[PDB]
């Protein structure tokens, strides 16, 4: 039985969250678009090994839109990590395995470095380190135009699995539509300079497992592979591209349970 509910933290945010299972805590942090329906299948799968899976829409996005604008403007890994630690406190999750991709990747590594006693271990996927003008220049377009462009970027380039993407259904895509603009204005300019990955030595030794999409063009996260390898951090691949939990749930959920298990 999945809990589907809301909970409020004292930084102004009213979070939509979901939760399934009994066991050590695994937390699935969404990517930029902040939409936790993307995890729905994997939540059940991971929970059926013995875990309590929690996930949530991110502040300003989908059903967690009731939040103050500092929460979704000029966003940074550090800020997102603050927010995630606040919803974790509210749900009395003391010790969590965490996953996160893209801005979620940034967020979990910043969790891992900033709050070592709270994070059993962290899985980051395709952590953004470089600015990226095609994305960034959409911020100053009108809402709606942005939605047309970003919707299309997600669909054709970057799911790694376009059928699966579309199959999320009309509701989810209606929520994403409203999300694109807030993301375009809040994330692409400011997330990458915040990357907590410039201090190689702080990564060394940490319980961190880093991945990239197998199908993703080598240029997109070449830097993740260089950085991880210099820092001794475990790195490898998942199938697809930027959303392994949409395109390849079964392998995604396997990878999460299997990696969590290593750090118990």
Ligand X SMILES: C[C@H]1CCC[C@H](O)CCC/C=C/c2cc(O)cc(O)c2C(=O)O1
The residues of the shown chain that bind a copy of itself, judged by CB under 8 A, are 212-222, 225-226, 229-230, 235-237
Cβ atoms of 151 and 180 closer than 8 Å: yes
Contacts of 189 (CB under 8 A, 6+ apart): 74, 131, 136, 139
DSSP state of 197: T
CB of 67 to a copy of itself, least distance (A): 34
Under rule CB under 6 A, residue 122 binds ligand X: no
Q: How far is CA 191 from CA 97, 123, 152, in A?
A: 22, 18, 21
Number of alpha carbons in the 13 Å side-chain half-sphere of residue 135: 20
Cα gap 40→204, rounded to integer Å = 33
CB of 76 to ligand X, least distance (A): 10
CB of 159 to ligand X, least distance (A): 8
Residue ranges in 183-222 that form contacts with ligand X under rule CB under 6 A:
187-188, 191-192
Residue ranges in 81-110 that form contacts with ligand X under rule CB under 6 A:
102-103
Site string for ligand X, 136-155 (x = CB under 6 A): -----------------xx-
Under rule CB under 6 A, residue 18 binds ligand X: no
216 is in the binding site of which of a copy of itself, ligand X, none (Cβ under 5 to 8 A by kind)?
a copy of itself
- Give the residue with the Cβ less far from a copy of itself, 151 or 215: 215
Q: Which residues pair with 212 in a beta bridge?
A: 237
Tell me how many residues contact ligand X (CB under 6 A): 15
| CA nearest neighbour of 90 among 156, 161, 12 | 12
Q: How is residue 205 written in tokens?
A: 């030794």
54 membership: H or E segment, kind and range: strand 52-56
Which residue of 20, 31, 35, 57 would you call a contact of ligand X, by CB under 6 A?
31
Residues that bind ligand X (CB under 6 A): 31-33, 102-103, 128, 153-154, 157-158, 187-188, 191-192, 242
């Amino acid at each position: 039985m999945r809990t589907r509910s809301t909970i409020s933290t004292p930084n102004g945010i009213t979070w939509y969250y979901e939760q399934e299972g009994t066991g050590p805590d695994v937390v699935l942090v969404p990517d930029g678009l902040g939409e936790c329906q993307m995890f729905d299948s994997s939540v059940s799968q991971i929970a059926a090994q013995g875990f309590r899976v929690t996930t949530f829409d991110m502040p300003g996005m989908s059903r967690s839109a009731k939040a103050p604008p500092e929460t979704y403007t000029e966003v940074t890994a550090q800020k997102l990590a603050s927010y995630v630690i606040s919803v974790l406190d509210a749900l009395d999750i003391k010790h969590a395995t965490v996953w996160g991709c893209a801005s979620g990747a940034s967020t979990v590594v910043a969790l891992l470095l900033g709050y070592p006693d709270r994070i059993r271990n962290a899985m980051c996927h395709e952590l953004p380190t470089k600015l990226l003008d095609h994305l960034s220049n959409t911020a100053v377009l009108e809402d709606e135009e942005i939605s047309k462009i970003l919707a299309n970027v997600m669909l054709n380039d970057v799911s790694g699995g376009s059928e699966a993407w579309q199959a999320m259904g009309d509701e989810v895509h209606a929520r994403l539509h409203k999300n694109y603009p807030v993301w375009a204005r809040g994330y692409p300019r400011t997330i990458p300079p915040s990357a907590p990955v410039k201090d190689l030595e702080a990564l060394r030794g940490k319980p961190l497992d880093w991945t990239v999409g197998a199908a993703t063009p080598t240029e997109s996260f070449f830097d993740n592979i260089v950085t991880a390898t210099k820092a001794g951090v475990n790195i490898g691949l998942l199938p697809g591209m930027h959303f392994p939990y949409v395109s390849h749930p079964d392998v995604f959920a396997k990878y999460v349970v299997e990696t969590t298990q290593k750090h118990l």
